Amino acid sequence: SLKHSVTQYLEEIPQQVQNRLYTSPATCLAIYRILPPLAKFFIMAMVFNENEVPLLDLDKWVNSNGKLQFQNAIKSMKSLHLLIPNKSSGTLMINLNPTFKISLRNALTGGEVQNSFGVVVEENVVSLDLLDEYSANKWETILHFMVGTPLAKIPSEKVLNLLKHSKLMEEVNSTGEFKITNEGFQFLLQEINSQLWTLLLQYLKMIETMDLVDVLHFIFMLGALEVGKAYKILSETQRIMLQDMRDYGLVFQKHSIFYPTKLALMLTSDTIPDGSLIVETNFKIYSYSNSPLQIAVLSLFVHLKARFVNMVLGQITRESIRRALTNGITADQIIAYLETHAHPQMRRLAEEKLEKKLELDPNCKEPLQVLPPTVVDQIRLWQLELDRVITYEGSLYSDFETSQEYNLLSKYAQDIGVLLWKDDKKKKFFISKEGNSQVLDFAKR
């Protein structure tokens, strides 16, 4: 959902703002890589010709088999307003945006760029020792403060404010603490590339009055920069933006020159495993991971018992699962984490069981489960235990003078989808507190 998320945000932006956004070649190049492969093919054809092509011609290129992909491509391009459909002389002519066409032309042909990609100071620093360590630690710190594990250096107010108001890491003053939510666990599950965009996308919505295009302009060219290089300093809004960028471990400053980091390059949709753990019948967890971040996330629903340098060993318990469920983590998410962080050995034995299953009877092909089904059943059963009681808040209706009135009132509540339960014998029905006013309003009417 990376290209979907970035693309969807661009669509919501008004066309008037999009035109100004396409001014810099850098952002146009980044936006070009987001469109579907067919869209890029048409765009490249149209960038280098200052003419008008009728719509039907582009359709002729697409084969009959790939006709479906044509509909998606044209729809995506039109929504971003990159392609301007002009109708005249009885034909629906097609043309490319003049600003976008010029922007792409300069980048490819090396025309005047107005320092969109930045400048080089020729003062490089060691990437492995400094850039990797700084961003890794800074990104590590924010993650720890999100998973709830104690950490000395808490994040700054800027990122702290962003996390709270967003769905991530819901906080309550009365509780006096911060805890993860259903979306928060998904955020942790998402790979680093999608993990970074979620925070950046939320920040883009947080900024107010700072221009929306300027923030988008800075973010796009940041990926264009190459790690381990200097870049001298930019818009006035981009200045405070650059300092705020340091809070997320994307750019490093000594105190005039800013250095992009691995995360900065990774932003622009760049193309045994650590975290693998063994889940077995005895509800014992053996995670072959050596990293506090992996340990912290595991503790959300695993009762850790001890840790070695090479791995951490723990046990799944009813208390541990309930703790995660209470916060808002769903069981389906938990199994996804277990399945996606499986040990290679588990797959082989599961495949061996499948091979024997096929040998005895090859007529059945069920989706293979890396971890034993018993763990799945118990975890889901515990979820059912927490959902044992279902309660709704609202009001009750009784003592209707006429049966027709009761039916009329009940029927309307069903129409507006606020009727929860009803009994014809007792002439009673219960409605949700949310739709209590609507039912009462209809009663008066």
């Binding site: 019948t281 005895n282 005895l360 034993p372 089904p373 018993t374 059943d377 118990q378 059963l381």
Partner: protein, 142 residues
Amino acid sequence: QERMNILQNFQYNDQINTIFLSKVGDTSIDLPEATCLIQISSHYGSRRQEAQRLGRILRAKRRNDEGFNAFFYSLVSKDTQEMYYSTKRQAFLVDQGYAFKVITHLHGMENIPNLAYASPRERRELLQEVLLKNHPLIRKMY
């Protein structure tokens, strides 16, 4: 004598294929033909009873034929102390390696022609019954 006769019939006769045993046969009994086991209710928190009873069907003669899997069931009433006992007594098998599967519902059970205490009248009759549970000369005269 009687139990042996029942045991012999259950083994060598095709007519009878099921028996209802008790704690008597919980240990050191050889039943090669036994493959399926059902435990409606048993001895509280005892663990060895669960394992030893499971050993009866581990004796299956046809334990090498392809696709053979002995069946071991433990019917437990929901929302009852039996769950506390049941989870405690099977704590030894899990250590050995056997894993227990939860069966919330048996497919095709409703289509069975007849079931015990299906009508409410029969159920109430059971409820009341279970609730109600707690001189040689003189000899000739006569």
